[PDB]
Amino acid sequence: TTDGINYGREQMIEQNEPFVYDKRVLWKRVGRIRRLIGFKLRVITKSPVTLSGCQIRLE
Amino acid sequence: MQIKTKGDLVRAALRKLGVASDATLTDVEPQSMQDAVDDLEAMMAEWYQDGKGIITGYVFSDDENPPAEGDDHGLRSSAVSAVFHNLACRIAPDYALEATAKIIATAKYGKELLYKQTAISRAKRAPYPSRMPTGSGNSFANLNEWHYFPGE
Amino acid sequence: MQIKTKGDLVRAALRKLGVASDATLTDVEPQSMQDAVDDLEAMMAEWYQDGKGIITGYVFSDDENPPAEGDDHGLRSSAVSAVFHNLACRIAPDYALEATAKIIATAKYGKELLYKQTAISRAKRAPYPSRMPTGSGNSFANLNEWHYFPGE
Amino acid sequence: MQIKTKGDLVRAALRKLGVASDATLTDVEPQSMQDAVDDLEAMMAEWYQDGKGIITGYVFSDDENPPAEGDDHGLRSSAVSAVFHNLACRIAPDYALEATAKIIATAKYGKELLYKQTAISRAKRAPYPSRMPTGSGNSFANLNEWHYFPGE
Amino acid sequence: MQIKTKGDLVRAALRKLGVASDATLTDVEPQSMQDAVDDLEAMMAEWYQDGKGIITGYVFSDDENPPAEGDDHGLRSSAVSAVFHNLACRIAPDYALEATAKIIATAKYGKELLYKQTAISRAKRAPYPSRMPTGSGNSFANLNEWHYFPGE
Amino acid sequence: QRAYANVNTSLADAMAVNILNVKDARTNVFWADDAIRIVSQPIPANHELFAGMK
Amino acid sequence: IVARTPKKKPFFWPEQIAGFEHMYDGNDDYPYYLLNRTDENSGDLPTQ
């Protein structure tokens, strides 16, 4: 989102895999922040989701 | 070529700059994209100096056919890279940016390569002067002593 | 070209600087536009030194017309980029800003290109000195006793 | 030209410095404006070295006509940018400031461009020395009366 | 060679850059692959200036075929390294990266090796001028009246 | 320039243009002998045309 | 070689002599030649 209310385009990044214990969930290219930005990070599974250490590169 | 209109040239410039692409979760507004198209048109008009500059085949958009974006740029296959690298360099200051060293080098090299063939064609020798004879070796037979025919 | 008015040139200059446009949410302020139009008029009146300077086709505003903004600038297609890059450089100090190196380089290139054709046209050779014989090869001169070239 | 008075030049210089303009929420005292006008008058009188320096059409304000601001400066349309850029450079130290590199460069360019035409006009050649014969070619020009150049 | 396709070239370039490899657990993003292939096609068309540039045997994909990726590039076995090192250099700024000194050096070396054989082939000597005689030692020609070289 | 005048007035707005050949007629022709001239020259051979021709 | 070869003339940038172009055409109406010194972007013209 760029305004805190309205969210934009959604990209599907593969977040888990059966019996793969080393995955590196990552999205290479994100946009250019005009004034503001926030992220959504939505998940739909039947299995446990463990997420930590969200990091970005600003340059 | 996958790049075929001024819109695609602008999108490639933005992709190289890292501002926007088909992968980014955020994109630039259509007004910004239109301004970039205007920047490209101005740059190409400044280059092609009413016929006495760099000849590229660029086709200038008209005001009657409304969207300048979407018009085929008309460039050859070999000019696309140079044109959109130079466009990225030109429009980077709009986004408080600075086109990186590789982009600058590619733009310079591409502009050189664009003008190479035109420079080769424009390197021509003027005809002989007005007070130069054509010599006895030509002047015998047909008695021509001052013409220097421009046939070839 | 979509840039056809003094306000359009000012908008392009402000967008280059990073003061207006949609790459940032900032919008053009009327008090910051009138000042830039004043600066553009002064800059082009200085460049066009009463016709003895750079010729670009710019049309100078008259005191009768209320807004100088809104008029066509009258430039050709190949002058717009030079004019508004130099305008961005000129008006940068108002906002305590500083035109980026790319903008300065493009402004220099554009000004040189603007004067190139005028320089070619003004590169002219003087007539023969008044104290110079026409020679005996010039048959017509030997006929009507035009032994010496006029001069000046 | 929308800058028609000495106070208008002073206000343009202040806007270039960023101290005060039509858009700022704080302005400068009328005493400050009068001081800047006096500085402009001194700078113009120093330039125009009593007729042996830069000629710019400046009209000096007499004391009987009380306000100097409000008088038409008399500068041509092409001198305004140079004059107000140099004035900004001159009055920058009053506000514990220092004009930017762009302002200084435009000041230098404008001053040189101001003198250019006077330089061309004053690049004259001295007459022939009085110890020089006219030659026997100019016999029938002077009716064989004087054979030496006048001089002085 | 195990690098038979444009996608193989692109994957090698991304691995050189360290963006999507197996040494780092990253998969090639499908949005990155198309952008890199477009950059490869642009750079190849730029190099091969309609036959008057670097000849490499690369095959340009037409608009007819659906996948621009999957097609053999057609390079020789000794051009693969040069092509994909240059491609990594070109597409590094897409991700706000910078190819390291070894990659840049290998790109320079590879491009020079690409052009070496063509440079040798094009190092051709022009024939004798049309005004040069054959000499009387060329007995057959000077008997059959071929006293001068043709030229061109 | 007026010294070169050969007519009295000038063409003024709707001035009728009378045609003097109102029917077909073979033409007799008179002149001063110094009016028609024939300027002739042999074509310079050994050039684009007349190449190889002797 | 004598006929078709450019003669010995100076090399100028257009900005160097912009405004003084009639001084270099070949007349003798002047005592010296003038060059443009400053630039509005670089501040000063490069010396070569």
Side-chain angles (χ1 to χ4, degrees):
Chain A
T1 177
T2 36
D3 51 353
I5 301 158
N6 293 37
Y7 282 72
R9 175 186 103 82
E10 289 205 285
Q11 171 77 39
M12 283 188 219
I13 306 117
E14 169 182 319
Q15 177 253 338
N16 206 336
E17 193 136 22
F19 323 123
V20 165
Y21 309 90
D22 159 80
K23 181 131 208 72
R24 205 203 270 286
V25 184
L26 170 142
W27 184 243
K28 278 295 180 168
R29 265 145 43 173
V30 201
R32 168 219 163 224
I33 302 166
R34 184 156 77 147
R35 205 175 49 114
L36 295 152
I37 205 159
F39 301 100
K40 197 189 226 181
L41 199 53
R42 160 160 87 81
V43 175
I44 298 189
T45 88
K46 283 186 199 181
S47 314
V49 187
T50 316
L51 292 175
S52 44
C54 178
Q55 73 174 40
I56 208 172
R57 173 163 68 104
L58 273 185
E59 264 218 347
Chain B
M1 190 85 194
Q2 281 293 284
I3 288 155
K4 288 190 255 244
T5 88
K6 318 188 200 322
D8 325 290
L9 278 178
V10 164
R11 294 201 271 291
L14 293 167
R15 174 172 62 56
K16 297 303 304 172
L17 271 172
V19 168
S21 167
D22 276 299
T24 66
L25 311 167
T26 83
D27 199 271
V28 294
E29 218 205 348
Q31 173 81 335
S32 289
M33 275 263 312
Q34 156 158 92
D35 293 350
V37 172
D38 281 344
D39 277 26
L40 160 72
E41 293 268 285
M43 176 218 322
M44 288 315 256
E46 151 159 300
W47 285 9
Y48 173 79
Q49 278 266 313
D50 270 313
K52 342 216 177 173
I54 312 181
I55 271 68
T56 37
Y58 195 68
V59 152
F60 282 89
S61 38
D62 62 75
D63 307 285
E64 195 224 337
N65 199 260
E69 170 145 13
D71 284 297
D72 305 67
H73 41 53
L75 300 152
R76 20 191 176 78
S77 201
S78 46
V80 157
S81 156
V83 169
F84 81 71
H85 279 113
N86 266 291
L87 186 49
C89 275
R90 283 259 198 150
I91 74 185
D94 298 40
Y95 309 90
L97 254 186
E98 178 77 60
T100 193
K102 177 62 190 206
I103 297 174
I104 296 172
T106 321
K108 276 148 58 47
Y109 171 80
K111 218 182 138 176
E112 254 274 353
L113 253 58
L114 273 173
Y115 196 70
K116 177 181 289 183
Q117 291 303 127
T118 319
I120 276 174
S121 63
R122 258 153 202 182
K124 264 181 302 303
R125 264 171 171 231
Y128 272 85
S130 37
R131 291 169 288 182
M132 180 86 237
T134 166
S136 160
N138 303 299
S139 147
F140 99 102
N142 74 307
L143 258 63
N144 187 40
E145 261 165 0
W146 305 89
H147 277 8
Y148 275 116
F149 285 138
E152 51 254 19
Chain C
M1 57 207 186
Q2 280 283 288
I3 314 199
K4 216 153 297 181
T5 45
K6 305 186 196 320
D8 267 277
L9 294 175
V10 170
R11 286 200 269 281
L14 295 165
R15 160 161 67 70
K16 274 312 171 283
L17 272 183
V19 152
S21 85
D22 299 51
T24 51
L25 281 146
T26 324
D27 36 6
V28 192
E29 281 143 45
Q31 328 201 250
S32 100
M33 153 93 58
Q34 190 182 74
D35 294 339
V37 165
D38 271 341
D39 267 41
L40 167 68
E41 288 274 292
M43 154 170 96
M44 311 275 318
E46 157 154 305
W47 282 5
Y48 178 84
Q49 287 261 319
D50 286 317
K52 329 184 77 82
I54 301 184
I55 271 71
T56 40
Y58 191 74
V59 158
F60 290 101
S61 42
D62 36 28
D63 302 295
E64 195 267 315
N65 207 247
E69 162 38 359
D71 295 306
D72 302 12
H73 42 48
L75 300 158
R76 19 194 175 80
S77 206
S78 53
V80 163
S81 158
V83 165
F84 77 64
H85 274 100
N86 290 275
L87 183 55
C89 284
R90 283 246 186 160
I91 72 176
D94 287 32
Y95 320 91
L97 278 195
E98 186 77 55
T100 166
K102 179 58 200 190
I103 285 179
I104 289 178
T106 312
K108 293 160 63 44
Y109 177 72
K111 221 182 141 176
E112 212 220 348
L113 262 203
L114 267 187
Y115 192 69
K116 170 183 290 182
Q117 283 295 312
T118 309
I120 281 182
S121 147
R122 272 162 210 209
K124 265 204 312 305
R125 236 189 161 180
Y128 268 104
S130 95
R131 297 182 280 166
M132 171 85 198
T134 36
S136 99
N138 287 87
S139 43
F140 64 103
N142 265 45
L143 288 170
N144 42 284
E145 302 328 303
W146 186 42
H147 307 130
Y148 286 69
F149 283 108
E152 198 161 50
Chain D
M1 49 150 154
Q2 286 296 283
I3 294 158
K4 294 162 93 153
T5 46
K6 315 196 195 319
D8 263 6
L9 289 171
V10 165
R11 291 196 271 281
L14 281 163
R15 172 191 78 227
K16 260 305 170 273
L17 290 179
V19 168
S21 63
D22 286 316
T24 63
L25 301 168
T26 75
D27 204 310
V28 305
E29 205 195 9
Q31 182 74 244
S32 297
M33 208 89 54
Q34 182 187 258
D35 292 340
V37 167
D38 286 329
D39 264 8
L40 158 76
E41 275 263 350
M43 181 215 58
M44 281 325 278
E46 160 170 272
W47 283 10
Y48 171 78
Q49 197 84 19
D50 304 351
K52 283 140 169 314
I54 312 186
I55 271 72
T56 45
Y58 202 64
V59 184
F60 287 106
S61 45
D62 40 38
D63 319 308
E64 203 254 307
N65 209 266
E69 138 57 4
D71 295 303
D72 290 358
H73 42 45
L75 291 154
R76 20 191 172 78
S77 203
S78 42
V80 173
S81 156
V83 165
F84 90 73
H85 276 111
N86 270 99
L87 184 51
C89 276
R90 283 252 180 171
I91 74 180
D94 292 40
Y95 313 97
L97 222 48
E98 179 62 43
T100 45
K102 181 60 194 201
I103 299 177
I104 301 175
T106 323
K108 302 161 59 47
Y109 178 67
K111 219 185 150 282
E112 174 147 80
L113 220 52
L114 268 186
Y115 194 70
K116 173 181 292 181
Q117 287 301 314
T118 321
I120 280 149
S121 150
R122 274 181 221 171
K124 268 190 322 290
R125 227 187 210 295
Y128 273 110
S130 44
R131 279 197 284 184
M132 177 93 177
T134 57
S136 35
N138 324 285
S139 284
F140 333 102
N142 52 62
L143 321 180
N144 216 321
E145 272 165 59
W146 28 275
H147 329 91
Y148 281 73
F149 277 104
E152 171 195 80
Chain E
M1 45 178 189
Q2 287 275 293
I3 304 202
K4 305 131 142 51
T5 37
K6 307 194 202 320
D8 288 4
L9 282 189
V10 167
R11 287 199 274 275
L14 300 174
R15 171 180 50 102
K16 294 332 310 193
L17 278 179
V19 158
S21 61
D22 209 340
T24 70
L25 304 137
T26 325
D27 301 329
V28 281
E29 313 194 319
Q31 282 104 343
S32 281
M33 178 82 38
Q34 200 203 19
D35 300 347
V37 162
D38 279 3
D39 268 16
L40 161 68
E41 296 271 280
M43 142 177 146
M44 270 326 178
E46 155 150 296
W47 285 11
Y48 181 81
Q49 295 273 326
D50 290 321
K52 290 160 167 25
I54 309 178
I55 282 87
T56 45
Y58 185 99
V59 202
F60 307 93
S61 38
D62 44 24
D63 306 275
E64 200 211 341
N65 204 235
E69 170 30 30
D71 296 307
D72 303 358
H73 43 46
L75 305 154
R76 20 187 174 82
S77 210
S78 51
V80 177
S81 157
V83 174
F84 81 67
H85 276 102
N86 276 265
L87 183 50
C89 278
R90 278 246 187 159
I91 75 198
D94 274 43
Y95 321 79
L97 285 191
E98 177 72 46
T100 177
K102 182 58 197 207
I103 296 181
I104 307 166
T106 325
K108 291 158 57 47
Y109 175 80
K111 213 182 138 169
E112 211 197 24
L113 284 204
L114 282 183
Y115 196 67
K116 169 184 291 176
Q117 287 308 308
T118 319
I120 278 171
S121 154
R122 284 181 221 201
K124 272 199 306 313
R125 218 194 231 286
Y128 282 89
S130 44
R131 283 181 285 179
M132 181 85 218
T134 36
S136 34
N138 293 298
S139 35
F140 188 59
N142 288 63
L143 277 194
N144 285 44
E145 306 167 40
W146 284 310
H147 307 133
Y148 287 77
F149 283 114
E152 178 203 272
Chain F
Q1 287 167 339
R2 206 172 273 111
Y4 290 102
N6 51 285
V7 296
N8 67 344
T9 36
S10 47
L11 318 185
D13 273 28
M15 219 184 231
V17 173
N18 325 132
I19 46 190
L20 301 189
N21 50 14
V22 280
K23 79 163 311 183
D24 290 281
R26 214 164 204 104
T27 165
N28 319 268
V29 165
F30 60 95
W31 67 40
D33 271 26
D34 54 69
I36 278 276
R37 160 189 321 203
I38 307 182
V39 157
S40 165
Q41 203 216 305
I43 315 197
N46 282 46
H47 70 305
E48 327 104 349
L49 286 321
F50 313 80
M53 316 269 264
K54 223 152 280 304
Chain G
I1 272 156
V2 168
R4 336 164 68 180
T5 282
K7 335 225 169 273
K8 172 148 144 279
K9 310 176 177 180
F11 279 112
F12 286 132
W13 290 330
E15 308 215 281
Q16 260 185 330
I17 65 169
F20 308 113
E21 284 114 341
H22 39 267
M23 271 180 171
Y24 297 93
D25 58 351
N27 49 56
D28 291 345
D29 312 324
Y30 296 109
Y32 47 74
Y33 307 112
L34 297 181
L35 302 161
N36 271 330
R37 154 186 171 246
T38 43
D39 203 7
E40 83 149 89
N41 302 280
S42 97
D44 199 309
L45 259 173
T47 294
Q48 228 272 349

